Amino acid sequence: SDDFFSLAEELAPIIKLINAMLGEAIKEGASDIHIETFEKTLSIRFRVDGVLREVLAPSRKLSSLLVSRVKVMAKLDIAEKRVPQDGRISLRIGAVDVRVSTMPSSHGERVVMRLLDKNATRLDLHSLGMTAHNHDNFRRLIKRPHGIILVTGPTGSGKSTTLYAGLQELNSSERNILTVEDPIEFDIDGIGQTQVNPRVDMTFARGLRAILRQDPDVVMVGEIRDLETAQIAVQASLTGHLVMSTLHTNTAVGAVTRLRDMGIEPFLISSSLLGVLAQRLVRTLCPDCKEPYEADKEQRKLFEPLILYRATGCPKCNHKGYRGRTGIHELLLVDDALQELIHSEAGEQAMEKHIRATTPSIRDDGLDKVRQGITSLEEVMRGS
Ligand SMILES: Nc1ncnc2c1ncn2[C@@H]1O[C@H](COP(=O)(O)OP(=O)(O)NP(=O)(O)O)[C@@H](O)[C@H]1O
Ligand SMILES: [Zn+2]
Numbered sequence: 001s002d003d004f005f006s007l008a009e010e011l012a013p014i015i016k017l018i019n020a021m022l023g024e025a026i027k028e029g030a031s032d033i034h035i036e037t038f039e040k041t042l043s044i045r046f047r048v049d050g051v052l053r054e055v056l057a058p059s060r061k062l063s064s065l066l067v068s069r070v071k072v073m074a075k076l077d078i079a080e081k082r083v084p085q086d087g088r089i090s091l092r093i094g095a096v097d098v099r100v101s102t103m104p105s106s107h108g109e110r111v112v113m114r115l116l117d118k119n120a121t122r123l124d125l126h127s128l129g130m131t132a133h134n135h136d137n138f139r140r141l142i143k144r145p146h147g148i149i150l151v152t153g154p155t156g157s158g159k160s161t162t163l164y165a166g167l168q169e170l171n172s173s174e175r176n177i178l179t180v181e182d183p184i185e186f187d188i189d190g191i192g193q194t195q196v197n198p199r200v201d202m203t204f205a206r207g208l209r210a211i212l213r214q215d216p217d218v219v220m221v222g223e224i225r226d227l228e229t230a231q232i233a234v235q236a237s238l239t240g241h242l243v244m245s246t247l248h249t250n251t252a253v254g255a256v257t258r259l260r261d262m263g264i265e266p267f268l269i270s271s272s273l274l275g276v277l278a279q280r281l282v283r284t285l286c287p288d289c290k291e292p293y294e295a296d297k298e299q300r301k302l303f304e305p306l307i308l309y310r311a312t313g314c315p316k317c318n319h320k321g322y323r324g325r326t327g328i329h330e331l332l333l334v335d336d337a338l339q340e341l342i343h344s345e346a347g348e349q350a351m352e353k354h355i356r357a358t359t360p361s362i363r364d365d366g367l368d369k370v371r372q373g374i375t376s377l378e379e380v381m382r383g384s
Contacts, residue, residue, distance in 0.1 A: 008056050014065045018073070025115060026093050032115060035070070037063045037108030050318025063108045070111050074100040081109060089113075118186065125165040128158070129326035131365065137331055138277060142166045142244070147274035148237040150224075151246045152255050157279045158327055159246040160185055163220060166244060167191060170218055178214055180207040181222040196222075204229045212236055221245040227263045234264055237272040251362075252278035252332040253351045256342055270342035276332040280362055282369070282379045283322035289314035290321060290373070299377060302367060309373040326374065328365040333358070 004024035007017055025033050025046055034045040034052075042063050044056040068078050074087025082104050089098040099114035130138060141149060149166075151159045164185065167177060171190045182196040182204065192214070194207050204221060205228045211219050212232075223246045224230050237243040249258045255276040259269050295306040311321035332355055334342075341351050366380030 005056075008058065011059060012069075014062075014069050018066065018069050022091070022096075022098070022113070022115075023093060025113075026096060030115060033113040035063075035066050035111045037105065037110070039107050042066075050315065067102065067109050067111055070100055070113065071102065074098075076100075076102070121161060122186070123161055123165060125162075125169045128162055128165060129369075130329055131368070134329050134331050134365075137333065138166075138275075139169065141275050141331075141333070142170060142242070144242060144274055146237055146240050146242055148233060148243045148245070148272045149274050150255050150276045151244070151279060152249050152252065152276055153246075153279040154248060154250060156281060158281050159279060160222075162277065162279065162327070163244055163246070164188070167218075167220060175217040176215060177218040177220070178211045178216045179220045179222075180204060180211060181220075205232060208232050208236070212239075212241070216241060218242045218244070223247065224262075230259060230262055230264050234268050234272045238268070242274075243272075249278075251348070251352075252276045252330045253348045253355070254278075255332075256351065257348060260345065266345050267343050270334075270339040273334050273342070275334055278330040278332070278362055280328050280366070280383050281325050282328055282366060282375045282383070283320070284324040284326050285309055285311060285373070285375055285379075286314060286317040286321045286323045288316045288323075292373075302377070303371065306371075307373070308370060308377060309375075311376050311378070322379075326369070328362055328369060328380070330362040330365060331359060 002016065002020045002023060004020040007013070007020050021033065021044070028046060028048055030046045030048045032047040036043045037060065040060065042058055042060050043054060044058070045052055046055050071078050071087070074089050076085045076087045084104070085102045087100045089100060091098060095118045097116045097118055099116070100111065101114070102109045102111045125139065126135065151162050153159055167188060170177060171188060173190070178192040178194070180194045180196065184193045184195050187193065196202055196204055196207060204225065208219070208221055208229060209232055219236060219241055221229065221233060221243065224233060233243050233245060247255055247258050249255050256269060256273070260266055289312045290309045291312050292307050293310055295308050299308070300306055313321040317323045338351065338354055341354060363380070363384050369375050370377050370380050
């Protein structure tokens, strides 16, 4: 039921159109949908496997309606027309994550729906691209009885993915693993998952307090945004729970800084923190069109002829010569000397200096993967 092109042949029905268009986009395997306004006409385009195409040019009159409709679905400001807006939608087709972005433009806000699959995001702990060392130390870390483990990085770092991987590795029936999320990304099975619900003042803080009355061995908090959730988090870790969470800081040592700045007692950070996994996503070079070169003298400084690889571009990729992505990481492990450094508020430079004797930086991690020709030198250097 409900074909986009049929419904297009007639000039709400604006709800049946949007759903049908989404439905047709998914049927075609399209990555993105574009609704744009031009002075004398309107335009709908679909991107499929790189290729962009016009699929419909309905009357200019419809533009304000299709824009509004996508807004209300993504939970946004119908009134606001002058500034960018970004919403989310979860939908069942017969499950699709659709990211909608709008934008002021010379004849009407432009809109794109980003349409991602829910499943390609579901990776296990050995499939995130951790090096053998990081993998080993991280697996030994999440198996500890109590303390806080933070997964950190900027937006798009893949922090939710590595939490889920970690939880799944622990998901035995000997453990009681409870979760509070905003929202839940999916169901794991074996793990009690709890969504934050603003509609009843069920916040991260309230939910996490409740979790502790359910006798958990491990608890996950979707993220630590305010002092209050940090306070409970730290108390939970100090009373025999293993706690896992995220911050959006930019370095492993910056996690400590962020915690202090938020107002957690420096001593209490130093006695609860087990470790901080800082993390970035780099695109993996398309193995089909990736081209070998010989590193020049300046590129060598960063590391016989040294063979690295470069992007290029082909149909099997599209926009650039990259298919897929992988993680690069830095795993901070707390020891006696570092506790002193945290407690004494020594600062980022002194903590980093200490950690380097044992652990390589995210850049070195990235550079190793460049060496292996998994990714380009550009892709690693641009985030650094
Ligand atoms: N190791 C990995 N390899 C490939 N893809 C990954 C990896 N880790 C995460 N991803 C994907 O990258 C996207 C970002 O991951 P997500 O787990 O949503 O990140 P995040 O940092 O938690 N997000 P946010 O805090 O909302 O910006 C998702 O679409 C995941 O599929
Ligand atoms: Zn390619």
